[model samples]
Target: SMNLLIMGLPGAGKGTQAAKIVEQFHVAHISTGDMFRAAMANQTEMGVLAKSYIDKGELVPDEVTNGIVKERLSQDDIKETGFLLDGYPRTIEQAHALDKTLAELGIELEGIINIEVNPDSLLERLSGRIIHRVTGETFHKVFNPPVDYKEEDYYQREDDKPETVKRRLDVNIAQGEPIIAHYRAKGLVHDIEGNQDINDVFSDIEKVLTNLK
Candidate 1:
């Protein structure tokens, strides 16, 4: 019965903000990427469905994703708490599907949070990103670099390389722009300027959501 979406391009801090919001609010973070990881970890029905496509180097269709999300949204764990979604609803099709699913459950999305970051900054941030991929712990060169990266077993995801980051940014904007436009026209979107300091960005978000109701 809980529904909210956090929309951001790559390296726009969607993951970080989602984690913070989940810790502070009574909301489950239901990002598609995170859900994929969860499903894989638990090996649930939806996980099994997603695994075949992923294992075969194929994209999981939106219908499979929608089914998984619908199943998750109906669970008892979500009744007492709302949710903050990220990384799903990348296209108009997925967003509409989410709308239908929520309508079936007698719920509607409360907000669509958009974190606006400059593509240039995104390039810089992403270029510097490194992960302990084994543990899924992330670090950045400018903001939060690891203590002993040279000595540690760390690797940058090929997707996080500079060139790949640019490609991703281009793809992200192409796909994410329409989704943002749809929500914007509906007045359901909250834009957070991410060009400023991190705290300032979060402050804008806090103020907006506090007045949302």
Candidate 2:
């Protein structure tokens, strides 16, 4: 069983790698975005609270997010099979909250996989992405273009725009550094180079996980 957290900036291939990890390890995949969607769909208490802020275009406070996470982790599936957490604890404060939550649940984090990608590459990857208006399918101008590409049919997300991506990367790096440092001091952080081929990166991750076992 693996109880791990995967951390990366936007466009660092965290989603792809997370799916692979879950498939291989048979651990519950507990991505924050998916958890929020499920909770909202089920009308869970924290979800309802989170939806109120979202409806008002306000950020969900840390306590609400923390409650949602604790609720998810308390489920039997995670307790039985362990978990792979992604896309939570974006700040040092949230990281601390997660630590307390995990300790109270009697679950120790096995590892923190920090996928490191170059900011230049991330900028190009994120900024080049455009989504189909009707299908919501994503395509990249340079890497993976649509079969019938049309300027009018596809739109770039405001979050994916170059300037916005740069700012987001800066903010992620600023928040991520302290979280990484916090875990690094505990000897639980495994830095994986994410600039290479997907297989190569996964192999590096496999090495760390294998050693953990």
Candidate 3:
């Protein structure tokens, strides 16, 4: 199967856009963040084990993360359908580990989609985005949100705070450079103009994947 990985910063709309991709392409979406959250909710054995590392903001072991991803893709529903991997392979080592795991499952990455956006827009979006503090349902203030609810003191994430988004961008760029370069060298990197509108971005993405070599 032709697997795909959408790599981007936190506020680059990865989840929203990835949702569209999964719906249209009918591929399983493998999100390590989602998987971890499921573990925490279920409080499963694996979730308990991952909590120790997560508590200290450390990456989970390769086997643990890979196992979750591998299992998800192996299910009957997705065994034949392919997948969109997001928020995993956060490091160079994880990238290699993912490669081996996919090989075992007979899946090969078709390409890497990189959404390029400036730090300014990211800062504004992340900072402005709001959420239901109790329910945890997120809604972007600028793009998608409930009407008649516009205020600065609205619910926001600590990571989405001004100082944090800036530093997070810097650190994300630093950590992602190598992964970007790796895929680029393999002719698997596609850079989309993320500074533009959503429709335009989707058009460019479709063109890139259509002509992907």
Candidate 4:
């Protein structure tokens, strides 16, 4: 199975990269957030387990998340084509749990891709972010501003603030470094430049995956 993990700080273009990778590789994109919603909708066994914590406004415990991920990974699509995990495994503990789950299936991760971009550049990019919350149309004041920009019509989200960007970046590093190091130890970490053109970044990732072939 060509299983992989896509990881990076917020605004690192993971969603875009994940889409391109899925298109190219024909692998399932398994996002924990989407899985949670689907499980809740279908009322799956693990979904019911996760919902207990979610309904109480608490984080779903790792065991619940692990169970959900195990269930998701066991699906026919994932089993057939493997997967690119978009989220989940946020902590070292979760990462280990994933290892155990995959081991049970006699599968090991193919790679852990980390998109790296300069911090200051990400801050500038995020700081100018604006969106029409209703339509969810996004704009960057410096790079993709809407022609009829109206402050009242759009949300200048707190997430777009410089301080907020730094906080998230810091937290991502704090949580992500160990995971990266862990995978790196197994020689499974592949770092890609996120500041490049979208195709260029994907090209590099394609190169990495080509090597795997």
Candidate 2 root-mean-square deviation in Å: 3.4
Each prediction's Cα lDDT score? 0.82, 0.90, 0.76, 0.86
The Cα RMSD of model 4 versus the native structure comes to 3.3
Compare candidates 3 and 4 on TM-score and give the better one. 4
Per-residue alpha-carbon lDDT of candidate 2 for residues 1-213, written as tens digits (9 for 90 to 100)? 888999999889899888888877888888889889877887999999999999999999999999999988888888789898998888899999999999999999999889999988888888998988897598888799899787788888898789999998999999999999999999999999998988898999889988997
Per-candidate alpha-carbon RMSD to the true structure: 5.0, 3.4, 4.9, 3.3
Clashing pairs in 4: none
Clashing residue pairs in candidate 3, if any? none
Stretches of candidate 4 off by over 4 Å are 131-139, 145-155
What is the C-alpha lDDT profile of model 1 across 152-210, one tens digit per residue? 55677798788888998999899899999988998989998877776777778778777
With a 3 Å backbone cut-off (N, CA, C), the pairs that clash in candidate 2 are none
Query: In model 2, where is the ten-residue run with the lowest total lDDT?
Result: 20-29
> Model 3 has how many clashing residue pairs?
0
**Winner of 1 and 3 under lDDT:** 1
- Which model scores highest in lDDT? 2
TM-score of each: 0.81, 0.87, 0.75, 0.87
Q: Per-residue lDDT for 164 in model 1?
A: 88
Cα deviation of 101 in candidate 1 (Å)? 0.9
